[PDB]
Amino acid sequence: SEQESVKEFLAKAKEDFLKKWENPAQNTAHLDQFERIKTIGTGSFGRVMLVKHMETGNHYAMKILDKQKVVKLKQIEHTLNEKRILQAVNFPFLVKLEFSFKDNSNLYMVMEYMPGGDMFSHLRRIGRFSEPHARFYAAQIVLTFEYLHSLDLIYRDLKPENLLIDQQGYIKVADFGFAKRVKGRTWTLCGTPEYLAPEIILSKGYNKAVDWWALGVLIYEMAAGYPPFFADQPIQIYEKIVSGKVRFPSHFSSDLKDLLRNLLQVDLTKRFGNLKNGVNDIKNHKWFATTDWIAIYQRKVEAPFIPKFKGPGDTSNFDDYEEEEIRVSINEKCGKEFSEF
Amino acid sequence: TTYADFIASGRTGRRNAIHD
Ligand SMILES: C[C@@H](N)[C@H]1CC[C@H](C(=O)Nc2ccncc2)CC1
């Protein structure tokens, strides 16, 4: 069976993950091994910089978290989740963590650098993706969620902003700031407004089904050019999501609509991904009938879009940000809170 | 159109995550 080769794949993958989960990599480099080049991302949850490792010459993306800002934002345990999970995982469509370390002031996570930029920037520019184009990316997500959920991981922030395009035109999921290893239900309110399942909004206690709901949002946005539930302010977006009504553009194929009605399904006993058949309800769906799941895993499918290669440290696919100092205090901040990082 | 309403809205740039 294809379901049995697959079960075998996941068994090996889990034994691999647990070994790193139970004994995490720690303190594997130092800031002064990296030359800083450019801020390619900034936000509430730290910034991301292009750097260059001197000993190898390799370019990398370095996420910096101010430990004091993390404590004030009450993201201590999420930050610890993020690093422990990213260091343990291993899958083609997950951005790979090369190093992590910390100093008196900061936490650092050095990832492989994707010069091609995020899906977001290309989706906005082009307007929308063709169904075949959107399906190609959706398949990568479907498989990644298959892998994550098999490890008891929920991702909780699927959106085009968190998806990077590599040099073969395949995607990498980045930012694990709200990922959590949980076997039961959980209750934290987190995610991005447009992508939130109704059960998060209504404060109910949820599981990995929220990840499949967010898949439906993503595929919709990719093929429509805009998301299924938008407005100018979050509370208005929440009223739309909980209403149970969604409108599709007249260009959506009738298979795409039917897939999306089962992903953006309020009723958890009916939502694709959450039922007795699990991820095969998605994988065997007619919209995906031309998808060869193994060749997508193997990166043998021809990509609809390969971004323009401008050098290994080129930054033209990212916007410009105001550059700040990386200041390292002479006193240790929050030693105890982050000891396991 | 729906696309035109989207493109005139304030939420066409990169969206931030929320938290309680
Ligand atoms: C919007 C946020 N949730 C977050 C999305 C991912 C981004 C990043 O890691 N970019 C990146 C990583 C590796 N290589 C190139 C870019 C940082 C900002």
PDB file of all heavy atoms in Angstrom, chain A residues 40-43 45-48 60-63 95 111-118 155 157 159 161-164 173-175 192 318, chain B residues 14-17, ligand 1:
ATOM      1  N   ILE A  40      16.429  41.629   6.871  1.00  0.00           N
ATOM      2  CA  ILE A  40      15.473  41.213   5.848  1.00  0.00           C
ATOM      3  C   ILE A  40      14.077  40.890   6.434  1.00  0.00           C
ATOM      4  O   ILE A  40      13.214  40.367   5.752  1.00  0.00           O
ATOM      5  CB  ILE A  40      16.007  39.985   5.071  1.00  0.00           C
ATOM      6  CG1 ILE A  40      16.421  38.867   6.031  1.00  0.00           C
ATOM      7  CG2 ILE A  40      17.147  40.371   4.156  1.00  0.00           C
ATOM      8  CD1 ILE A  40      16.436  37.515   5.379  1.00  0.00           C
ATOM      9  N   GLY A  41      13.868  41.200   7.697  1.00  0.00           N
ATOM     10  CA  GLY A  41      12.583  40.974   8.330  1.00  0.00           C
ATOM     11  C   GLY A  41      12.595  41.525   9.734  1.00  0.00           C
ATOM     12  O   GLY A  41      13.612  41.423  10.429  1.00  0.00           O
ATOM     13  N   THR A  42      11.503  42.171  10.141  1.00  0.00           N
ATOM     14  CA  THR A  42      11.400  42.742  11.495  1.00  0.00           C
ATOM     15  C   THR A  42       9.977  42.658  11.963  1.00  0.00           C
ATOM     16  O   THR A  42       9.044  42.543  11.156  1.00  0.00           O
ATOM     17  CB  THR A  42      11.939  44.229  11.629  1.00  0.00           C
ATOM     18  OG1 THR A  42      11.915  44.643  13.009  1.00  0.00           O
ATOM     19  CG2 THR A  42      11.026  45.252  10.974  1.00  0.00           C
ATOM     20  N   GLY A  43       9.825  42.703  13.280  1.00  0.00           N
ATOM     21  CA  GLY A  43       8.533  42.519  13.895  1.00  0.00           C
ATOM     22  C   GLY A  43       8.602  42.335  15.390  1.00  0.00           C
ATOM     23  O   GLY A  43       9.684  42.319  16.031  1.00  0.00           O
ATOM     24  N   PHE A  45       8.059  39.890  17.226  1.00  0.00           N
ATOM     25  CA  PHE A  45       8.776  38.685  17.606  1.00  0.00           C
ATOM     26  C   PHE A  45      10.168  38.631  16.975  1.00  0.00           C
ATOM     27  O   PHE A  45      10.532  37.662  16.291  1.00  0.00           O
ATOM     28  CB  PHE A  45       7.893  37.509  17.231  1.00  0.00           C
ATOM     29  CG  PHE A  45       6.528  37.557  17.919  1.00  0.00           C
ATOM     30  CD1 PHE A  45       5.472  38.314  17.368  1.00  0.00           C
ATOM     31  CD2 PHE A  45       6.308  36.886  19.141  1.00  0.00           C
ATOM     32  CE1 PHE A  45       4.219  38.369  18.015  1.00  0.00           C
ATOM     33  CE2 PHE A  45       5.057  36.946  19.783  1.00  0.00           C
ATOM     34  CZ  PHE A  45       4.023  37.682  19.233  1.00  0.00           C
ATOM     35  N   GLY A  46      10.937  39.695  17.222  1.00  0.00           N
ATOM     36  CA  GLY A  46      12.326  39.796  16.806  1.00  0.00           C
ATOM     37  C   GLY A  46      12.528  40.143  15.339  1.00  0.00           C
ATOM     38  O   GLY A  46      11.605  40.490  14.633  1.00  0.00           O
ATOM     39  N   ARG A  47      13.764  40.063  14.888  1.00  0.00           N
ATOM     40  CA  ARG A  47      14.116  40.384  13.509  1.00  0.00           C
ATOM     41  C   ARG A  47      14.933  39.273  12.899  1.00  0.00           C
ATOM     42  O   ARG A  47      15.475  38.426  13.598  1.00  0.00           O
ATOM     43  CB  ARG A  47      14.898  41.699  13.440  1.00  0.00           C
ATOM     44  CG  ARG A  47      16.144  41.738  14.264  1.00  0.00           C
ATOM     45  CD  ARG A  47      16.538  43.132  14.717  1.00  0.00           C
ATOM     46  NE  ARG A  47      17.263  43.054  15.988  1.00  0.00           N
ATOM     47  CZ  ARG A  47      18.368  43.737  16.283  1.00  0.00           C
ATOM     48  NH1 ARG A  47      18.912  44.606  15.411  1.00  0.00           N
ATOM     49  NH2 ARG A  47      18.930  43.553  17.471  1.00  0.00           N
ATOM     50  N   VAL A  48      14.982  39.280  11.580  1.00  0.00           N
ATOM     51  CA  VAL A  48      15.774  38.354  10.841  1.00  0.00           C
ATOM     52  C   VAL A  48      16.763  39.111  10.002  1.00  0.00           C
ATOM     53  O   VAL A  48      16.362  40.000   9.262  1.00  0.00           O
ATOM     54  CB  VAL A  48      14.902  37.484   9.970  1.00  0.00           C
ATOM     55  CG1 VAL A  48      15.758  36.604   9.050  1.00  0.00           C
ATOM     56  CG2 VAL A  48      13.976  36.630  10.849  1.00  0.00           C
ATOM     57  N   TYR A  60      23.516  32.823   5.633  1.00  0.00           N
ATOM     58  CA  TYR A  60      22.463  32.298   6.505  1.00  0.00           C
ATOM     59  C   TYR A  60      21.494  33.425   6.947  1.00  0.00           C
ATOM     60  O   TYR A  60      21.822  34.606   6.864  1.00  0.00           O
ATOM     61  CB  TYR A  60      23.093  31.717   7.762  1.00  0.00           C
ATOM     62  CG  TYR A  60      23.932  30.472   7.564  1.00  0.00           C
ATOM     63  CD1 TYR A  60      25.279  30.472   7.867  1.00  0.00           C
ATOM     64  CD2 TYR A  60      23.368  29.315   7.097  1.00  0.00           C
ATOM     65  CE1 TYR A  60      26.048  29.356   7.702  1.00  0.00           C
ATOM     66  CE2 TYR A  60      24.126  28.177   6.917  1.00  0.00           C
ATOM     67  CZ  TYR A  60      25.473  28.214   7.215  1.00  0.00           C
ATOM     68  OH  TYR A  60      26.215  27.117   7.071  1.00  0.00           O
ATOM     69  N   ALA A  61      20.296  33.057   7.382  1.00  0.00           N
ATOM     70  CA  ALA A  61      19.327  34.001   7.962  1.00  0.00           C
ATOM     71  C   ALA A  61      19.321  33.808   9.450  1.00  0.00           C
ATOM     72  O   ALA A  61      19.071  32.702   9.917  1.00  0.00           O
ATOM     73  CB  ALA A  61      17.984  33.739   7.433  1.00  0.00           C
ATOM     74  N   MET A  62      19.607  34.865  10.183  1.00  0.00           N
ATOM     75  CA  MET A  62      19.767  34.811  11.619  1.00  0.00           C
ATOM     76  C   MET A  62      18.628  35.548  12.276  1.00  0.00           C
ATOM     77  O   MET A  62      18.479  36.752  12.078  1.00  0.00           O
ATOM     78  CB  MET A  62      21.080  35.486  12.027  1.00  0.00           C
ATOM     79  CG  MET A  62      21.447  35.313  13.476  1.00  0.00           C
ATOM     80  SD  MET A  62      22.801  36.440  13.990  1.00  0.00           S
ATOM     81  CE  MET A  62      24.033  35.329  13.949  1.00  0.00           C
ATOM     82  N   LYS A  63      17.807  34.806  13.021  1.00  0.00           N
ATOM     83  CA  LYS A  63      16.759  35.380  13.836  1.00  0.00           C
ATOM     84  C   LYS A  63      17.280  35.772  15.189  1.00  0.00           C
ATOM     85  O   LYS A  63      17.849  34.958  15.875  1.00  0.00           O
ATOM     86  CB  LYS A  63      15.629  34.399  14.010  1.00  0.00           C
ATOM     87  CG  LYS A  63      14.459  34.913  14.831  1.00  0.00           C
ATOM     88  CD  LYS A  63      13.166  34.161  14.475  1.00  0.00           C
ATOM     89  CE  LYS A  63      12.092  34.265  15.567  1.00  0.00           C
ATOM     90  NZ  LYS A  63      10.974  33.392  15.153  1.00  0.00           N
ATOM     91  N   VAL A  95      12.343  24.796   6.817  1.00  0.00           N
ATOM     92  CA  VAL A  95      13.583  25.526   6.882  1.00  0.00           C
ATOM     93  C   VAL A  95      14.458  24.892   7.954  1.00  0.00           C
ATOM     94  O   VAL A  95      13.992  24.576   9.073  1.00  0.00           O
ATOM     95  CB  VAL A  95      13.397  27.078   7.156  1.00  0.00           C
ATOM     96  CG1 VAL A  95      13.224  27.378   8.651  1.00  0.00           C
ATOM     97  CG2 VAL A  95      14.591  27.832   6.676  1.00  0.00           C
ATOM     98  N   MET A 111      19.347  30.000  10.454  1.00  0.00           N
ATOM     99  CA  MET A 111      18.713  29.117   9.496  1.00  0.00           C
ATOM    100  C   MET A 111      19.384  29.244   8.104  1.00  0.00           C
ATOM    101  O   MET A 111      20.065  30.213   7.795  1.00  0.00           O
ATOM    102  CB  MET A 111      17.215  29.473   9.336  1.00  0.00           C
ATOM    103  CG  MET A 111      16.307  29.479  10.630  1.00  0.00           C
ATOM    104  SD  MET A 111      14.876  30.565  10.216  1.00  0.00           S
ATOM    105  CE  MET A 111      15.362  32.123  11.184  1.00  0.00           C
ATOM    106  N   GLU A 112      19.174  28.248   7.266  1.00  0.00           N
ATOM    107  CA  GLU A 112      19.560  28.323   5.878  1.00  0.00           C
ATOM    108  C   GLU A 112      18.840  29.509   5.201  1.00  0.00           C
ATOM    109  O   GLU A 112      17.660  29.783   5.500  1.00  0.00           O
ATOM    110  CB  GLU A 112      19.234  27.003   5.175  1.00  0.00           C
ATOM    111  CG  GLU A 112      17.742  26.637   5.174  1.00  0.00           C
ATOM    112  CD  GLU A 112      17.416  25.347   4.412  1.00  0.00           C
ATOM    113  OE1 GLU A 112      18.182  24.978   3.457  1.00  0.00           O
ATOM    114  OE2 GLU A 112      16.401  24.693   4.795  1.00  0.00           O
ATOM    115  N   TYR A 113      19.548  30.191   4.296  1.00  0.00           N
ATOM    116  CA  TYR A 113      19.068  31.405   3.656  1.00  0.00           C
ATOM    117  C   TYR A 113      18.392  31.080   2.318  1.00  0.00           C
ATOM    118  O   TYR A 113      18.959  30.356   1.501  1.00  0.00           O
ATOM    119  CB  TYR A 113      20.241  32.346   3.448  1.00  0.00           C
ATOM    120  CG  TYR A 113      19.871  33.626   2.786  1.00  0.00           C
ATOM    121  CD1 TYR A 113      18.942  34.455   3.357  1.00  0.00           C
ATOM    122  CD2 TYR A 113      20.419  33.998   1.570  1.00  0.00           C
ATOM    123  CE1 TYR A 113      18.591  35.604   2.771  1.00  0.00           C
ATOM    124  CE2 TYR A 113      20.040  35.171   0.954  1.00  0.00           C
ATOM    125  CZ  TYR A 113      19.127  35.977   1.555  1.00  0.00           C
ATOM    126  OH  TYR A 113      18.724  37.208   0.996  1.00  0.00           O
ATOM    127  N   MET A 114      17.158  31.571   2.163  1.00  0.00           N
ATOM    128  CA  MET A 114      16.357  31.490   0.947  1.00  0.00           C
ATOM    129  C   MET A 114      16.290  32.878   0.284  1.00  0.00           C
ATOM    130  O   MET A 114      15.387  33.671   0.619  1.00  0.00           O
ATOM    131  CB  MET A 114      14.910  31.121   1.286  1.00  0.00           C
ATOM    132  CG  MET A 114      14.709  29.887   2.212  1.00  0.00           C
ATOM    133  SD  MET A 114      15.312  28.477   1.411  1.00  0.00           S
ATOM    134  CE  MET A 114      16.570  28.106   2.496  1.00  0.00           C
ATOM    135  N   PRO A 115      17.210  33.176  -0.636  1.00  0.00           N
ATOM    136  CA  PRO A 115      17.218  34.474  -1.343  1.00  0.00           C
ATOM    137  C   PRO A 115      15.953  34.772  -2.162  1.00  0.00           C
ATOM    138  O   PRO A 115      15.601  35.944  -2.394  1.00  0.00           O
ATOM    139  CB  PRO A 115      18.422  34.344  -2.291  1.00  0.00           C
ATOM    140  CG  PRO A 115      18.583  32.823  -2.451  1.00  0.00           C
ATOM    141  CD  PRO A 115      18.348  32.317  -1.053  1.00  0.00           C
ATOM    142  N   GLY A 116      15.278  33.726  -2.595  1.00  0.00           N
ATOM    143  CA  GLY A 116      14.058  33.897  -3.351  1.00  0.00           C
ATOM    144  C   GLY A 116      12.877  34.619  -2.709  1.00  0.00           C
ATOM    145  O   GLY A 116      11.932  34.940  -3.410  1.00  0.00           O
ATOM    146  N   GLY A 117      12.909  34.902  -1.416  1.00  0.00           N
ATOM    147  CA  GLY A 117      11.826  35.656  -0.794  1.00  0.00           C
ATOM    148  C   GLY A 117      10.629  34.834  -0.339  1.00  0.00           C
ATOM    149  O   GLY A 117      10.596  33.625  -0.491  1.00  0.00           O
ATOM    150  N   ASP A 118       9.627  35.487   0.218  1.00  0.00           N
ATOM    151  CA  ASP A 118       8.430  34.780   0.656  1.00  0.00           C
ATOM    152  C   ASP A 118       7.357  34.624  -0.455  1.00  0.00           C
ATOM    153  O   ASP A 118       7.363  35.330  -1.474  1.00  0.00           O
ATOM    154  CB  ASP A 118       7.864  35.412   1.965  1.00  0.00           C
ATOM    155  CG  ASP A 118       7.425  36.835   1.802  1.00  0.00           C
ATOM    156  OD1 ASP A 118       7.248  37.362   0.691  1.00  0.00           O
ATOM    157  OD2 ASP A 118       7.197  37.494   2.837  1.00  0.00           O
ATOM    158  N   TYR A 155       1.328  23.553  14.188  1.00  0.00           N
ATOM    159  CA  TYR A 155       2.160  24.647  13.650  1.00  0.00           C
ATOM    160  C   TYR A 155       1.624  26.046  14.016  1.00  0.00           C
ATOM    161  O   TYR A 155       2.380  26.909  14.471  1.00  0.00           O
ATOM    162  CB  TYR A 155       2.309  24.500  12.138  1.00  0.00           C
ATOM    163  CG  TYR A 155       3.058  25.645  11.500  1.00  0.00           C
ATOM    164  CD1 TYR A 155       4.342  25.962  11.931  1.00  0.00           C
ATOM    165  CD2 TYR A 155       2.490  26.424  10.497  1.00  0.00           C
ATOM    166  CE1 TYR A 155       5.039  27.021  11.411  1.00  0.00           C
ATOM    167  CE2 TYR A 155       3.188  27.513   9.960  1.00  0.00           C
ATOM    168  CZ  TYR A 155       4.473  27.797  10.407  1.00  0.00           C
ATOM    169  OH  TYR A 155       5.235  28.865   9.925  1.00  0.00           O
ATOM    170  N   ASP A 157       0.626  28.828  12.535  1.00  0.00           N
ATOM    171  CA  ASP A 157       0.768  30.133  11.857  1.00  0.00           C
ATOM    172  C   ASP A 157       0.972  30.030  10.362  1.00  0.00           C
ATOM    173  O   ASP A 157       1.772  30.753   9.771  1.00  0.00           O
ATOM    174  CB  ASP A 157       1.900  30.908  12.506  1.00  0.00           C
ATOM    175  CG  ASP A 157       1.808  32.451  12.261  1.00  0.00           C
ATOM    176  OD1 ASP A 157       0.708  33.027  11.985  1.00  0.00           O
ATOM    177  OD2 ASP A 157       2.851  33.145  12.306  1.00  0.00           O
ATOM    178  N   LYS A 159       0.623  30.889   6.769  1.00  0.00           N
ATOM    179  CA  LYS A 159       0.247  32.028   5.889  1.00  0.00           C
ATOM    180  C   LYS A 159       1.359  32.216   4.873  1.00  0.00           C
ATOM    181  O   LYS A 159       2.441  31.690   5.082  1.00  0.00           O
ATOM    182  CB  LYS A 159       0.029  33.294   6.697  1.00  0.00           C
ATOM    183  CG  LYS A 159       1.212  33.638   7.611  1.00  0.00           C
ATOM    184  CD  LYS A 159       0.814  34.657   8.668  1.00  0.00           C
ATOM    185  CE  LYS A 159       2.035  35.389   9.151  1.00  0.00           C
ATOM    186  NZ  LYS A 159       1.825  35.947  10.456  1.00  0.00           N
ATOM    187  N   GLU A 161       3.302  34.599   4.232  1.00  0.00           N
ATOM    188  CA  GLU A 161       4.423  35.274   4.876  1.00  0.00           C
ATOM    189  C   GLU A 161       5.414  34.332   5.518  1.00  0.00           C
ATOM    190  O   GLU A 161       6.589  34.695   5.699  1.00  0.00           O
ATOM    191  CB  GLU A 161       3.896  36.220   5.967  1.00  0.00           C
ATOM    192  CG  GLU A 161       3.074  37.401   5.451  1.00  0.00           C
ATOM    193  CD  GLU A 161       1.554  37.184   5.440  1.00  0.00           C
ATOM    194  OE1 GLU A 161       1.080  36.089   5.005  1.00  0.00           O
ATOM    195  OE2 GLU A 161       0.844  38.151   5.810  1.00  0.00           O
ATOM    196  N   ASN A 162       4.964  33.140   5.900  1.00  0.00           N
ATOM    197  CA  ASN A 162       5.825  32.169   6.624  1.00  0.00           C
ATOM    198  C   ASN A 162       6.381  31.113   5.681  1.00  0.00           C
ATOM    199  O   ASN A 162       7.053  30.155   6.104  1.00  0.00           O
ATOM    200  CB  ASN A 162       5.051  31.508   7.783  1.00  0.00           C
ATOM    201  CG  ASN A 162       4.877  32.452   8.985  1.00  0.00           C
ATOM    202  OD1 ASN A 162       5.271  33.608   8.918  1.00  0.00           O
ATOM    203  ND2 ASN A 162       4.323  31.953  10.080  1.00  0.00           N
ATOM    204  N   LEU A 163       6.086  31.279   4.391  1.00  0.00           N
ATOM    205  CA  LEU A 163       6.515  30.321   3.404  1.00  0.00           C
ATOM    206  C   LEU A 163       7.567  30.919   2.486  1.00  0.00           C
ATOM    207  O   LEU A 163       7.299  31.911   1.793  1.00  0.00           O
ATOM    208  CB  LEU A 163       5.304  29.847   2.615  1.00  0.00           C
ATOM    209  CG  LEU A 163       4.141  29.326   3.435  1.00  0.00           C
ATOM    210  CD1 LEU A 163       3.015  28.973   2.507  1.00  0.00           C
ATOM    211  CD2 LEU A 163       4.577  28.145   4.264  1.00  0.00           C
ATOM    212  N   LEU A 164       8.757  30.339   2.460  1.00  0.00           N
ATOM    213  CA  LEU A 164       9.814  30.874   1.608  1.00  0.00           C
ATOM    214  C   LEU A 164       9.996  30.065   0.339  1.00  0.00           C
ATOM    215  O   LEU A 164       9.822  28.851   0.375  1.00  0.00           O
ATOM    216  CB  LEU A 164      11.098  30.944   2.402  1.00  0.00           C
ATOM    217  CG  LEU A 164      10.877  31.947   3.536  1.00  0.00           C
ATOM    218  CD1 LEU A 164      11.560  31.530   4.805  1.00  0.00           C
ATOM    219  CD2 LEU A 164      11.384  33.314   3.131  1.00  0.00           C
ATOM    220  N   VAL A 173       8.749  26.093   5.102  1.00  0.00           N
ATOM    221  CA  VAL A 173       7.997  26.710   6.183  1.00  0.00           C
ATOM    222  C   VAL A 173       8.997  27.247   7.165  1.00  0.00           C
ATOM    223  O   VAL A 173       9.857  26.526   7.617  1.00  0.00           O
ATOM    224  CB  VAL A 173       7.092  25.685   6.881  1.00  0.00           C
ATOM    225  CG1 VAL A 173       6.290  26.305   7.993  1.00  0.00           C
ATOM    226  CG2 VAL A 173       6.182  24.954   5.874  1.00  0.00           C
ATOM    227  N   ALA A 174       8.913  28.529   7.485  1.00  0.00           N
ATOM    228  CA  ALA A 174       9.780  29.137   8.516  1.00  0.00           C
ATOM    229  C   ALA A 174       8.949  29.659   9.698  1.00  0.00           C
ATOM    230  O   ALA A 174       7.750  29.559   9.716  1.00  0.00           O
ATOM    231  CB  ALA A 174      10.605  30.227   7.912  1.00  0.00           C
ATOM    232  N   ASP A 175       9.595  30.203  10.695  1.00  0.00           N
ATOM    233  CA  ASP A 175       8.924  30.700  11.883  1.00  0.00           C
ATOM    234  C   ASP A 175       8.131  29.599  12.574  1.00  0.00           C
ATOM    235  O   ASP A 175       7.061  29.212  12.117  1.00  0.00           O
ATOM    236  CB  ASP A 175       8.046  31.911  11.560  1.00  0.00           C
ATOM    237  CG  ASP A 175       7.748  32.752  12.767  1.00  0.00           C
ATOM    238  OD1 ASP A 175       7.850  32.280  13.951  1.00  0.00           O
ATOM    239  OD2 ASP A 175       7.411  33.978  12.563  1.00  0.00           O
ATOM    240  N   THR A 192      -2.723  34.171  13.085  1.00  0.00           N
ATOM    241  CA  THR A 192      -2.890  35.440  12.382  1.00  0.00           C
ATOM    242  C   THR A 192      -4.394  35.537  12.048  1.00  0.00           C
ATOM    243  O   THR A 192      -4.970  34.559  11.614  1.00  0.00           O
ATOM    244  CB  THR A 192      -1.980  35.373  11.127  1.00  0.00           C
ATOM    245  OG1 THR A 192      -0.616  35.468  11.536  1.00  0.00           O
ATOM    246  CG2 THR A 192      -2.184  36.492  10.170  1.00  0.00           C
ATOM    247  N   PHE A 318      13.696  41.000  -0.752  1.00  0.00           N
ATOM    248  CA  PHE A 318      13.143  41.448   0.496  1.00  0.00           C
ATOM    249  C   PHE A 318      13.117  42.980   0.513  1.00  0.00           C
ATOM    250  O   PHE A 318      13.876  43.641  -0.225  1.00  0.00           O
ATOM    251  CB  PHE A 318      13.987  40.937   1.631  1.00  0.00           C
ATOM    252  CG  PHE A 318      14.112  39.447   1.663  1.00  0.00           C
ATOM    253  CD1 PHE A 318      15.207  38.821   1.114  1.00  0.00           C
ATOM    254  CD2 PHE A 318      13.121  38.668   2.267  1.00  0.00           C
ATOM    255  CE1 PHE A 318      15.310  37.428   1.162  1.00  0.00           C
ATOM    256  CE2 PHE A 318      13.225  37.310   2.310  1.00  0.00           C
ATOM    257  CZ  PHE A 318      14.312  36.684   1.752  1.00  0.00           C
TER     258      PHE A 318
ATOM    259  N   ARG B  14       2.117  42.650   4.896  1.00  0.00           N
ATOM    260  CA  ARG B  14       2.393  41.485   5.688  1.00  0.00           C
ATOM    261  C   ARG B  14       1.633  41.599   6.993  1.00  0.00           C
ATOM    262  O   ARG B  14       1.663  42.618   7.667  1.00  0.00           O
ATOM    263  CB  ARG B  14       3.898  41.344   5.934  1.00  0.00           C
ATOM    264  CG  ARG B  14       4.693  41.004   4.681  1.00  0.00           C
ATOM    265  CD  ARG B  14       6.137  40.624   4.951  1.00  0.00           C
ATOM    266  NE  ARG B  14       6.795  40.180   3.743  1.00  0.00           N
ATOM    267  CZ  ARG B  14       7.204  40.975   2.774  1.00  0.00           C
ATOM    268  NH1 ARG B  14       7.114  42.302   2.879  1.00  0.00           N
ATOM    269  NH2 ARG B  14       7.745  40.434   1.692  1.00  0.00           N
ATOM    270  N   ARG B  15       0.920  40.541   7.340  1.00  0.00           N
ATOM    271  CA  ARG B  15       0.106  40.533   8.549  1.00  0.00           C
ATOM    272  C   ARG B  15       0.886  39.994   9.740  1.00  0.00           C
ATOM    273  O   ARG B  15       1.568  38.972   9.648  1.00  0.00           O
ATOM    274  CB  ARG B  15      -1.162  39.721   8.318  1.00  0.00           C
ATOM    275  CG  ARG B  15      -1.976  40.258   7.148  1.00  0.00           C
ATOM    276  CD  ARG B  15      -2.793  39.236   6.424  1.00  0.00           C
ATOM    277  NE  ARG B  15      -1.967  38.279   5.673  1.00  0.00           N
ATOM    278  CZ  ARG B  15      -2.431  37.561   4.651  1.00  0.00           C
ATOM    279  NH1 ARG B  15      -3.692  37.677   4.239  1.00  0.00           N
ATOM    280  NH2 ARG B  15      -1.635  36.695   4.054  1.00  0.00           N
ATOM    281  N   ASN B  16       0.754  40.681  10.855  1.00  0.00           N
ATOM    282  CA  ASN B  16       1.288  40.230  12.138  1.00  0.00           C
ATOM    283  C   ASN B  16       0.431  39.196  12.841  1.00  0.00           C
ATOM    284  O   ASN B  16      -0.793  39.278  12.840  1.00  0.00           O
ATOM    285  CB  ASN B  16       1.450  41.433  13.087  1.00  0.00           C
ATOM    286  CG  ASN B  16       2.506  42.402  12.594  1.00  0.00           C
ATOM    287  OD1 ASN B  16       3.659  42.035  12.388  1.00  0.00           O
ATOM    288  ND2 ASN B  16       2.107  43.614  12.364  1.00  0.00           N
ATOM    289  N   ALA B  17       1.097  38.266  13.499  1.00  0.00           N
ATOM    290  CA  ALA B  17       0.429  37.337  14.386  1.00  0.00           C
ATOM    291  C   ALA B  17      -0.172  38.096  15.543  1.00  0.00           C
ATOM    292  O   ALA B  17       0.283  39.197  15.868  1.00  0.00           O
ATOM    293  CB  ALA B  17       1.433  36.309  14.912  1.00  0.00           C
TER     294      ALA B  17
HETATM  295  C1  LIG C   1       6.502  37.207   9.207  1.00  0.00           C
HETATM  296  C2  LIG C   1       7.182  36.393  10.317  1.00  0.00           C
HETATM  297  N1  LIG C   1       6.230  35.360  10.839  1.00  0.00           N
HETATM  298  C3  LIG C   1       8.536  35.780   9.823  1.00  0.00           C
HETATM  299  C4  LIG C   1       8.397  34.995   8.501  1.00  0.00           C
HETATM  300  C5  LIG C   1       9.730  34.305   8.131  1.00  0.00           C
HETATM  301  C6  LIG C   1      10.919  35.276   8.091  1.00  0.00           C
HETATM  302  C7  LIG C   1      12.168  34.471   7.851  1.00  0.00           C
HETATM  303  O1  LIG C   1      12.596  33.576   8.636  1.00  0.00           O
HETATM  304  N2  LIG C   1      12.787  34.783   6.619  1.00  0.00           N
HETATM  305  C8  LIG C   1      13.852  33.993   6.027  1.00  0.00           C
HETATM  306  C9  LIG C   1      14.431  32.799   6.610  1.00  0.00           C
HETATM  307  C10 LIG C   1      15.435  32.144   5.911  1.00  0.00           C
HETATM  308  N3  LIG C   1      15.862  32.646   4.737  1.00  0.00           N
HETATM  309  C11 LIG C   1      15.356  33.772   4.162  1.00  0.00           C
HETATM  310  C12 LIG C   1      14.344  34.492   4.779  1.00  0.00           C
HETATM  311  C13 LIG C   1      10.985  36.147   9.362  1.00  0.00           C
HETATM  312  C14 LIG C   1       9.608  36.859   9.601  1.00  0.00           C
END
